[PDB]
A paper describes a structure:
The inner membrane export gate protein, SctV (InvA in SPI-1 and SsaV in SPI-2), is the largest component of the injectisome and is essential for assembly and function of T3SS. SctV comprises a highly conserved N-terminal transmembrane (TM) domain and a less conserved C-terminal cytoplasmic domain (SctVC), which are connected via a ∼20–40 amino acid linker, SctVL, in most bacteria using the T3SS. It has been reported that SctV is one of the “engines” of T3SS; the TM domain forms a putative proton channel, and SctVC forms a nonameric ring connecting to SctN (ATPase) through SctO (the stalk protein) to function as the F0F1-ATPase, coupling energy from ATP hydrolysis and the proton-motive force to secrete unfolded bacterial effectors into the eukaryotic host. Consistent with other reported SctVC structures, the SsaVC monomer also has a four-subdomain (SD) structure and further assembles to a nonameric ring aligned to SD3, which is the most conserved region of SsaVC.
In this study, through generating a chimeric protein consisting of the TM region of InvA and the cytoplasmic region of SsaV, we produced the full-length SctV in a high-order oligomeric state which was adequate for structural study using cryo-EM single particle analysis. A homogeneous and oligomerized ISS protein was eventually obtained in buffer containing the detergent Glyco-diosgenin (GDN); however, SsaV (similarly to InvA) could not form the stable nonamer in this condition. We reconstructed a high-resolution cryo-EM structure of SsaVC with an averaged resolution of 2.11 Å. Unlike SsaVC, for which we obtained high-resolution structural information, the EM density of InvATM is blurry, and the SsaVL EM density is absent, with an approximately constant distance between the cytoplasmic domain and TM domain; this is consistent with a recent study. Structural comparison between SsaVC and InvAC in a closed conformation or its counterpart in flagellum, FlhAC, in an open conformation shows that SsaVC in a full-length context presents a semi-open conformation. The diameter of the channel at the center of the SsaVC nonamer ranges from ∼54-41 Å from the cytosolic face to the TM face. Consistent with the observation above, B-factor analysis of the SsaVC structure also shows that SD3 is the most stable region of SsaVC with the more flexible SD2 and SD4 floating around it. In each SsaVC monomer, the hydrophobic pocket at the connection region between SD1 and SD3 is occupied by a hydrophobic peptide (M346-V347-P348-G349-A350) from the neighboring SsaVL, forming the hydrophobic interactions between two adjacent subunits. Using 3D classification with this map as the reference without a local mask, the linker region was classified into variable conformations, with two major orientations, featured as left and right linkers (bottom-left panel).
Numbering used by the authors:
A (entry chain E), B (entry chain A), C (entry chain I): 346 to 681
Amino acid sequence: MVPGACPLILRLSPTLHSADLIRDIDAMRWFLFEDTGVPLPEVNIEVLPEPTEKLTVLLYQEPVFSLSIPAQADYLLIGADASVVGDSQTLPNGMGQICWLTKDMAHKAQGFGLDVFAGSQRISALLKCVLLRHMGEFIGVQETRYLMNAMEKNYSELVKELQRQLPINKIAETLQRLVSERVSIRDLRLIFGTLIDWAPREKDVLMLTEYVRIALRRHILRRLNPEGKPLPILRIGEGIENLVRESIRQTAMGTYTALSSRHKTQILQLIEQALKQSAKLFIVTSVDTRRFLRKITEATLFDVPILSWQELGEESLIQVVESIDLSEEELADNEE
Amino acid sequence: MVPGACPLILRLSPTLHSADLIRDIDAMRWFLFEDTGVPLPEVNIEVLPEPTEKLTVLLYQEPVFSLSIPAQADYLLIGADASVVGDSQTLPNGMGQICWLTKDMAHKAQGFGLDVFAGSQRISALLKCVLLRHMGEFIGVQETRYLMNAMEKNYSELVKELQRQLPINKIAETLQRLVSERVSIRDLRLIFGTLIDWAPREKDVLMLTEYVRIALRRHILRRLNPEGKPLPILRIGEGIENLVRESIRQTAMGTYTALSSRHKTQILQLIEQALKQSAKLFIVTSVDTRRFLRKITEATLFDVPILSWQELGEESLIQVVESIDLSEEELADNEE
Amino acid sequence: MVPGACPLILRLSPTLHSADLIRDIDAMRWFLFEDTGVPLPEVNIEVLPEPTEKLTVLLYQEPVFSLSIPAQADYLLIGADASVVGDSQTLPNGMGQICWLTKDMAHKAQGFGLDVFAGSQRISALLKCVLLRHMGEFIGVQETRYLMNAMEKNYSELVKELQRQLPINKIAETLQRLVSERVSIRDLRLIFGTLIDWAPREKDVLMLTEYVRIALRRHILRRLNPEGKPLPILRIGEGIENLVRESIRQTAMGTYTALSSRHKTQILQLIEQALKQSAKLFIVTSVDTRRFLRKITEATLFDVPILSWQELGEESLIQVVESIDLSEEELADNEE
């Protein structure tokens, strides 16, 4: 009886276990830390004797992932495309797609310019995927405390000033909000500086997160697209922007949105209908409506990034693909 | 004369005592801790010389369970079903049902896919049942203090921040309220984080418990149904919802419900009449009426879970079975 | 997993690496410190095995510079002019221009009175260029703390009085604002004295930065032109000055500018059109409009210096080249 659930459990059949799985998992953890700034806890491996090849991932002892690999599962390719086809299944909780390939098909797919995993790697490519879906569950008050203690080696004055400006709960909330939107918190020096700059003039954690996002726009654009090539952008029309802006209500803890269920459902439906034509799109809205749009779209569309006009500079061309726009619904259908 | 009643006493006849009873009881305690997050105290075994095979369970020296096993009691099956029939009695305080089976009938029931206990196990399966009915009696201020002290090994900052936000009596009240509704408090890290997040914006312990329940909805649904198969759902109609919502009165300590005895009795009667058609149903109501419905139904219907719409996500289909709805009674019978 | 991104990474192919690169880089860092007052962190050299000669510069692990040198790249000349022509490419993020020259052409260009780099020097001349574009990213609260601690050896009383007058966040903000406009902070004694003088009478960090700029006008003019020869000056007309002055709005944290997007775009367009006739021009405006003009022109025109009338004394002749002037746009086009 030890209070506190074990953070990370990976349960595997004895066949799936390998001698190099530990180092492979550690390398995946180091890659995730470098890519996101979130230091993950150690993965606890549990060998489960089972005739059927099954693997499960439990976060804090709650099963979040389960998958039975087929008997022919020897080469794995995350995602789907035209050049590769065969033995494709969709992972639960809308993580993405996985394809199982034979040796020659895996070789030709690797030659095509894709990553193919064999052996223990196939486990990591799965675990990493799951770990990428629940990153925000690994950054809280204690983890923020750990990051701040680590930052005191070279930035003792910065950490002291940040603590002078904000309590640890607000810092943890800001870091968690950043992590939940796939924004890396690797650059703690810049994030802490931005929080110090804006804390006296702003008490709302959501607005502080928006300011930090603006300060990190270089990294956000670098991660969204490695190259300067024009990636498609879907603009939110002025009708939706004003509809969501008029719903902003301010209380002592900051501003929230007060929109009807019909409105949110119709914007979500039209956005989803406007997302099926291409694999990836970036939704761009105004500065004062980006966070509210995200929080009314994060429940269903979690993997789509919501960008703000201030988050893209004037040195990047926009290549607008579509322009989604609607007016109110309850008062009058209007555009909807 | 030692002040403080002994928490857990199991009194057995010498025949029922076994050499492996201690380890069996300890395993049951470890299972209960893993399933509920509540660390139970040590069970004190008292051998009572009696010609009649009897066992009693006393919580804090008050007899809460008593049962005389028959002479043919050698295989025990908790619950009732169609495939198994014979020597069935109903446990007191509406715990459930117990069936005593012969060797061949126990073998066929085990083959049918049920759990059958023989020997000392039959005691534990009974004790565990009793322990599952009075879990909320083992989580108080001292037990909350113990859990927080245990959590300080890896989450010292989290515990310090929680103490900064809330006094120990409110934390204990929240934990007890969670335990009383069969919500596991195993994930203390998430519960403490939610309490830290919502404590500045909310002083009502019931509302804080509701927020923690919302944060734990993944585990709640996982426990209510292990699989994704559609389990039946009984919706509370809008008439009952508005009737109970109009009765909300707010004082300095928070909001309570002020409903007539006739109203509560009629809702309880109709809910019970709507529960007899199937073995298990999940009552689903609005967010602002879930706690009040629970506290007006917990006295009689303790084993039925009251869920809120926010507690089920949009990724689960609802399969509505019935729609209970009534208007007021005293002003006019209306639907009732 | 070490929290805190590595500040300075230079990634080179093994061919570009040299035995004297370390000392060359250190000399460049000492020159930059002497010229700007900003102590740079150590450059971390990473040798990347690649068939193509490529070099990248990453600030806090974010790639900010990338360039593939050609096979004939043996002599490098930063900038462009009439006497030198051949193999010229433009660096990204509008840093400037680079020209690759052959041995005899490099010799004749050096004789013409220009600096030509061969070997490891060609790397530094590139890195320095990049380091000159992002100097403001190396001066924050921790770096300000370091400079103040260094200043306590000979100016303990001055540092104590400055701390008595201002908190470290405001001092860091002032230093960063000075560095971002290519104003050296080498003379910390004078900057701290000015901040002590003006802190009781002024709480706005932007106004304090303006006062420090006024106190440092001797160095600013010395850096802008080494000689007393007449360098061209572009005056901002009274219409633009009054248009931007009427937009000044004051809140509890100081004064900001509230101008329409059309206004800012038209002033930027006319300034850019008025900058193409000559290689270098100095924009001169009023004292109360210099900072606002800079902050509405820094995003696009970062390398052009915005001067104030108080920043030039009466001992220097002005040699006005152009007089840009416009009225409002939205109310009426007027001059625009």
